[model samples]
Target: AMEKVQYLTRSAIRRASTIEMPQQARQNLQNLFINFALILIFLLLIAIIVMLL
Candidate 1:
């Protein structure tokens, strides 16, 4: 059976390329990590509220 999977678009994939990151890749990665962390925190808070209701 064939299975379908979602994949990142070309532009999205390109954002992670060496050209985009360059020497400052570390800073870019750190910023991405912080953004993801904040998103996770917000999702968890929403989940808790839904459970309480």
Candidate 2:
């Protein structure tokens, strides 16, 4: 009997990089975070409504 199994581990595969953004870019990033939070909260509210129904 022949069987094949594939498994892999990734550690220290790549180096991370850091970036410095302009003020405008930072502002946009903050806005993105706000939008993400709002979206998550909105979905939670919808779930609550359905649960109550």
Candidate 3:
């Protein structure tokens, strides 16, 4: 029973870190996409204003 407890303790910590890695990666992708969208929106607005003038 004692050896079993030690093995599980290490496994749980390793598994938790592996699980969190994907979540962190997904958040980074979301940030990059949002920034790109904002840039495109601003460029479109500028073009419309120049066309009207």
Candidate 4:
């Protein structure tokens, strides 16, 4: 759990640094990516389910 948290924080800091977003938008952009990942994962899971069914 600690490693997961550490990875997330470190990755976010590096990602925030690499993007086109301004400093003020960094956190929001990070949240956007999180939400986007959730949606993508949902679709990915559904695709796997369809293949396995």
Candidate 5:
């Protein structure tokens, strides 16, 4: 039995993304994580400064 499942028909189905043929997704995640790590560091620094003051 062959069936075509159409998920788009379900209005609740929102797209997170699509099938990747390129490194675009990976590169974006790498960039995001780099910034995210920096954000963490900044948070740590703020906490230290507050404690010292």
Candidate 6:
């Protein structure tokens, strides 16, 4: 029983670690997208002001 419990705990830890990697990647991708969007908006506003002038 003790051996089985240890094995289960190890498996759970490994699974949790694997799951965290993809979640971290997704968060990084989201940040990159947000930065790109802000830059695009800034450039668009500058273009609009230049056109008005």
Best by TM-score: 5
Q: What number of clashing residue pairs does each candidate have, in the order they appear? A: 0, 0, 0, 0, 0, 0
- Please provide, for model 2 over 1-53, each residue's C-alpha lDDT reduced to its tens digit, 9 standing for 90 to 100: 22222111111221222334454467668888998889889999898989988
Expressed as tens digits, the lDDT of each residue in 1-53 for candidate 3 is 69789777766664564455665468668877887788788889888889987
Which regions of candidate 4 are displaced past 4 Å? 1-24
State residue 47's C-alpha deviation in candidate 1, in Å: 1.1
- C-alpha RMSD of each candidate structure in angstroms: 8.9, 9.9, 9.3, 9.1, 7.3, 9.0
> What value does the lDDT take at residue 48 in candidate 2?
95
Please report the candidate that would top lDDT against the real structure: 4
Question: lDDT (CA) for every model shown?
Answer: 0.66, 0.59, 0.72, 0.78, 0.65, 0.76
- Candidate 5 lDDT over 1-53, as tens digits, reads 22234555332232244434445567678888998899989999999999988
Lowest summed lDDT window (length 10), candidate 5? 9-18
Candidate 1 wrongly placed segments (more than 4 Å): 1-23
lDDT of 2 at 21: 43
User: Given candidate 4, what's the lDDT at residue 44?
Assistant: 99
Give the total clashing residue pairs for model 6.
Answer: 0
* Residue 7 error, candidate 2, Å: 56
Tens digit per residue, CA lDDT, model 6, 1-53: 69889877866675565455666468668988998898899899899989988
Reference-based TM-score of each model = 0.48, 0.49, 0.47, 0.46, 0.50, 0.49
lDDT per residue for candidate 4 within 1-53, as digits (tens), equals: 69999877776785555555475477678888998899899999999999999
Instruction: Mark the 10 consecutive residues where model 2 has the least summed lDDT.
Output: 6-15
Q: After superposition, how far is residue 3 of candidate 6 from its true place, in Å?
A: 34
Per-residue error at 33 for model 2, in Å? 1.0
lDDT of 1 by residue, 1-53 (tens): 22222234434555565235453477678888998898899899899999988
